[model samples]
Target: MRKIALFPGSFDPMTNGHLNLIERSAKLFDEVIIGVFILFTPEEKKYLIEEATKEMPNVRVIMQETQLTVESAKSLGANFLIRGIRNVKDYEYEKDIAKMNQHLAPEIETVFLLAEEPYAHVSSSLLKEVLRFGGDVSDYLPPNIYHALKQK
Candidate 1:
């Protein structure tokens, strides 16, 4: 069978941390679908809808209406779900989520990749917070995402 994986993210703006996972996951899997979860709130809907619609072709975007992230991964025909971990604390929470996903979908496996030291502290929520307060975000997002946010 072909190796396929789902790299799910809110991708509020497809930050560099996201890119790091995408790039690495792509190398390991025959195809890595970038699954964009549409959280069920007006604010989340607006942000994720904009982000997925304007997503780069390299990272194919799979959109789903539910917050059941594993369901989204299964929709993409992923054998493994790729997640990025920045620190030890992240692993504790992520491990629980992973177990829940496995219990929900035994066919799919969850894998974690630690971000390189440079991106160990980066996150979409952090980027959004900085952007909202007029701090620079160039270092956080990919160039394409930067332009997309600017166009908004």
Candidate 2:
């Protein structure tokens, strides 16, 4: 049986940290599927992620509309849900969410990856905020995604 993992998040701009998590998950699982939650319907987000994962045939990029991520994971044949933790604070907060996901669906498991030091400080909220003010975040974003966001 193939072990599939679903990493669901806003991933508004798909950071280098998030891409590292995906790459790491790919090594542990047979396939890593990224579920980009569509909070306000950004086709550009999904498209950019898809383009970013072009070389990863085992990876898939899908826009998620479901309110419950566990349900979405189950439907996508994902036995695991993936998240990234950057610090002690995130670990504490992520702990509850992981427990809640397990509580809702015993079959699906939540896995956490500690962010590498270089990408530890990259978060979408702050990244977008900086970008909104014309700040450059080329170092924190995935290849070509920064250029794509600049264009959009």
Candidate 3:
């Protein structure tokens, strides 16, 4: 059986940190699904699809309407749920969520990855803030997404 893992996030705009997690997860799992939760915009979805295809062809991107992560994991037949922690705060919060998910769906396990340097501080909301103020966030975002947001 294939070792399938689900990495779910808002991904308002996929950041290098998010990409780092996905890239690492791709190598560990036979199949990795990038699940976009909470209704991403068309542009955001397009960005995710294009980048994932170009950078990680083995990974699949999908929009999930499910309100609960555990529900989505069970529905996707994911044996594992991948999460990334950037700091102690993030680790604490994710740990709580992971425990709840485990209680809800004991069949699916949660795997956490620590964010690498530079990308560790990168986040979609922070990127949006930088772009809002006309600050350069090219290094934090995918080239296409950076250009797309710049053109907006």
RMSD of each: 4.1, 1.8, 2.0
Least accurate 10 contiguous residues by lDDT in model 1:
49-58
Using all chains and alpha carbons, the TM-scores for the candidates as numbered come to: 0.80, 0.92, 0.90
Ranking of all candidate structures by their TM-score, best first: 2, 3, 1
* lDDT per residue (tens digit) for residues 49-145 in model 2: 8888777878999888858999989888999998999998889999989999889998888888899999988888889899899887888988678
Considering every candidate listed, which one attains the maximal TM-score?
A: 2
Model 3 over residues 1-152: C-alpha lDDT tens digits? Answer: 35899998887788878888888888899989888875447547755555645667678887877589988877888889999999888899999999999888888889989998888888777777887898888888767666666556
State candidate 1's TM-score.
Answer: 0.80
- The digit string of per-residue lDDT tens for model 1 on 91-151 reads 9989998999989988888888998888888877777788878788787776655655664
Comparing 1 and 3 by lDDT, which wins?
3
Which candidate number would show the highest lDDT if scored against the true structure? 2
Supply the TM-score for candidate 3: 0.90
Better of 2 and 3 by TM-score: 2
